[PDB]
């Protein structure tokens, strides 16, 4: 059995993936080596310790990356990094690991030798869960996105501040709801005061998310007008489906929304060529297990293609597939899918099952 080290395994991410391994047995598979960067069980950063491991599993951060990984690799160490942060996804030496969309690609890596295995951006794993069929029989000249994200993304500390601020709003307007009769336009001027406030908790957000959203999710690039995340959808898209070089334009917005845990995605899909729409359901919903087509009726996608219902599960629903007024070959799409599983732990899970068996 291969000795397997893992660290950040007590924060969010690395909560889930605790959760998603103790599910499917995957301890029995390895010897775990669990690590802590506490001083109050053995320490994160004892180069010696880590050593002795044949795979590092990390979910502790870019911080720790960038500070632990050089130092392990230039005392030589043959072995494999297993990472669930940003910080070494477009390394040359690192692979982006999402095994449904690109088993091919980690398979032709793990032959050529390399040792560098990190997960993907949520918002474009969960994109390539739900539509994988049509960038498998290269379908896809271009696709404009907008999406609805999750507080869970930005972290910890900002799923707490949303569920606060949610309270402070209604708490605002408390004995005005309980009476069926009050003015809704007074209800309304109490909780957008009450957003405008000073002791509203905007602290991890810049802005209030509770009721509102935010347009903007991590820095600014400069160069092309994008931020950080919508980058990604270009960057990241292409390098796990191993097209650098002949890049498939992904673009658009990345939104923050008042949902916990589940980013879901709008999304304008330029065709190559004019298929029919009961054939582009069978190209979708074949391409994995977890992808589920949902029919283009009121009940059903009120019922499945919600955070409500997505939320803390495997699924990838995708729905309100059709064609749009701009021609046959552009198609409508929304999919639902929960960020810490398939946008988090997931990819670095299976990887990792890989690596052991």
């Known amino acids: 059995m291969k000795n397997v080290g893992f660290i950040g395994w007590r924060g969010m991410v690395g909560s889930v993936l605790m959760d998603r391994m103790s599910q499917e047995n995957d301890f029995e598979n390895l010897n775990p080596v669990f690590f802590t960067t ?75 030798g390399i040792k560098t295995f990190v997960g993907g ?28 994200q999750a507080a869970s993304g930005a972290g910890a500390k900002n799923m707490r501040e949303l569920l606060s601020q949610m309270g402070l709003l209604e708490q605002a307007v408390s004995s005005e709801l309980k009476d069926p009769a009050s003015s809704i336009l007074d209800i309304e001027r109490k909780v957008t005061a009450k957003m405008r406030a000073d002791n509203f908790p905007t602290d991890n957000f810049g802005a209030a998310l509770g009721g509102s959203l935010i347009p903007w999710i991590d820095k600014l690039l400069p160069e092309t007008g994008q931020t950080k995340e919508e980058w990604r959808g270009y960057a990241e898209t292409n390098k796990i489906l191993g097209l650098s070089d002949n890049p498939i334009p992904v673009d658009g917005l990345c939104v923050r929304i008042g949902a916990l845990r589940c980013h879901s995605q709008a999304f304008t899909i330029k065709l190559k060529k004019d298929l029919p729409l009961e054939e582009i ?30 939320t803390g599960t495997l699924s990838v629903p995708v729905g309100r597939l059709r064609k749009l007024a701009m021609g046959p070959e552009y198609l409508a799409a929304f999919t639902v899918g929960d960020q810490l599983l398939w946008g988090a732990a997931e990819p670095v899970r299976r990887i990792l099952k890989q690596l052991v068996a």
């Open 38 to 112: 506490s001083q109050a069980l053995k320490s994160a950063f004892d180069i010696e310790e880590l050593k002795k491991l044949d795979i590092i599993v990390t979910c502790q951060g870019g911080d720790y990356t960038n500070e632990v990984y050089p130092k392990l690799k230039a005392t030589g160490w043959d072995g494999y990094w297993v990472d669930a942060a940003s910080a070494l996804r477009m390394k040359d030496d690192a692979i982006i690991v999402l095994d449904p969309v690109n088993q091919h690609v980690i398979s032709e890596g793990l032959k050529k």
């Open 281 to 310: 359901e069978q190209i979708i919903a074949s391409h994995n297990e977890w992808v589920k087509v949902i029919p283009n009726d009121k009940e059903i996608t009120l019922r499945e293609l919600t955070p409500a219902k997505v």
């Open 121 to 148: 951006n949520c918002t474009v794993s969960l994109m390539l869960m739900a539509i994988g069929g049509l960038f498998e029989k290269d379908l896809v000249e271009w696709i404009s996105v907008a999406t609805y």
